């Protein structure tokens, strides 16, 4: 009825469990003053040294990079022992994926503002040598009408689509341009209500379609011609010709009005 978690002396009462994974759980919790937080619990007892290293690495980067942008989820505190990790993080409304799934269409202004947030968080991690390499909507949390990156893709291991995967990741079987493609696929989904290769149901074919230059991606004409241009720029198969994040930050789509 009223279970608690302690983290660095501070007791937090669990309001409800909001998420889970392979031995990882996420809780909505309230502190002594009834302030809301998300606590991510990780059980470390089967984790190997390689896995542990990646976990510490992600915690370290999350801790450092949050001072550089408020579009990165706030890590308030954490307790880490040989058995468990508890992370006290800011609480949000809902992740971008869940919100997108129950949204018939997105307001053009909300879409542009979310895009800006996404570019800002991803730009920040890039400025410190991190390429996420696995961006999807689920990696972003909506907090006070603002998108926040909740992770940096460093974690080793604990569904899962290839809809957001870039062609050079598949051919090389990887740079900051790889994240631009995936962000492109998220924006495309926010624009056209599906991702560029969603219609292909065989995953092998889908992978083949992603790397095939004779497979042309559709860009149906829309009122916002700057949005359409951004999509075409992000979804160029050649990474050298693909637009960069700083180029995207100066794009009329994010700048003009």
The answer to whether the annotation marks 20 as part of a ligand binding site is yes
Method: X-ray
List the domain boundaries for the chain.
5-93, 94-257
The answer to whether the annotation marks 178 as part of a ligand binding site is no
Asked if residues 197 and 206 have their Cβ atoms less than 8 Å apart, the reply is yes
The answer to whether the annotation marks 25 as part of a ligand binding site is yes
Residue 134 bears catalytic tag: yes
Domains 5-93 and 94-257 share a fold: no
Taking residue 125's Cβ as centre, other Cβ atoms within 10 Å add up to 24
- CATH superfamily membership of 94-257: Transferase(Phosphotransferase) domain 1 (1.10.510.10)
Q: What is the DSSP letter of 88?
A: E
Q: Please list, in sequence order, all residues whose beta carbon lies within 8 angstroms of the beta carbon of residue 218, skipping any fewer than 6 positions away.
A: 192, 196
Give the architecture (CATH level 2) of 5-93: 2-Layer Sandwich (3.30)
Beta strands in the chain (DSSP E): 4-7, 10-20, 24-30, 36-43, 75-80, 84-89, 94-95, 140-143, 146-149
Asked if residues 219 and 201 have their Cβ atoms less than 8 Å apart, the reply is no
The answer to whether the annotation marks 23 as part of a ligand binding site is yes
The single residue of 53, 77, 82, 134 carrying the catalytic annotation is 134
SS3 (DSSP) at 3: coil
């Amino acid at each position: 009825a009223n279970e608690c978690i302690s983290v660095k002396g501070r007791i937090y009462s669990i309001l409800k469990q909001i998420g889970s994974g392979g031995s990882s759980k996420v809780f909505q919790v309230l502190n002594e003053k009834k302030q809301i937080y998300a606590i991510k619990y990780v059980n470390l007892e089967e984790a190997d040294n390689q896995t542990l290293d990646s976990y510490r690495n992600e915690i370290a980067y999350l801790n450092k990079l949050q001072q550089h942008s408020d579009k990165i989820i706030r890590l308030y505190d954490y307790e880490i022992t040989d058995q468990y990790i508890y992370m006290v993080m800011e609480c949000g409304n809902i992740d971008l994926n869940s919100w997108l799934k129950k949204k018939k269409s997105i307001d053009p202004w909300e879409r542009k503002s979310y895009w800006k947030n996404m570019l800002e968080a991803v730009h920040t991690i890039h400025q410190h040598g991190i390429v996420h390499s696995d961006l999807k909507p689920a990696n972003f949390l909506i907090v006070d009408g603002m998108l926040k990156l909740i992770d940096f893709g460093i974690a080793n291991q604990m569904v899962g689509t290839v809809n957001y995967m870039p062609p050079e990741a598949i051919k090389d079987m990887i740079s900051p341009k790889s994240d631009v493609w995936s962000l492109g696929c998220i924006l495309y989904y926010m624009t056209y209500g599906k991702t560029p290769f969603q219609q292909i149901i065989n995953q092998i074919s889908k992978l083949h379609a992603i790397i095939d230059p004779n497979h042309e991606i559709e860009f149906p004409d829309i009122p916002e011609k700057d949005l359409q241009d951004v999509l075409k720029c992000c979804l160029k198969r050649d990474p050298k010709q693909r637009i960069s994040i700083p180029e995207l930050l100066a794009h009329p789509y994010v700048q003009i009005q």
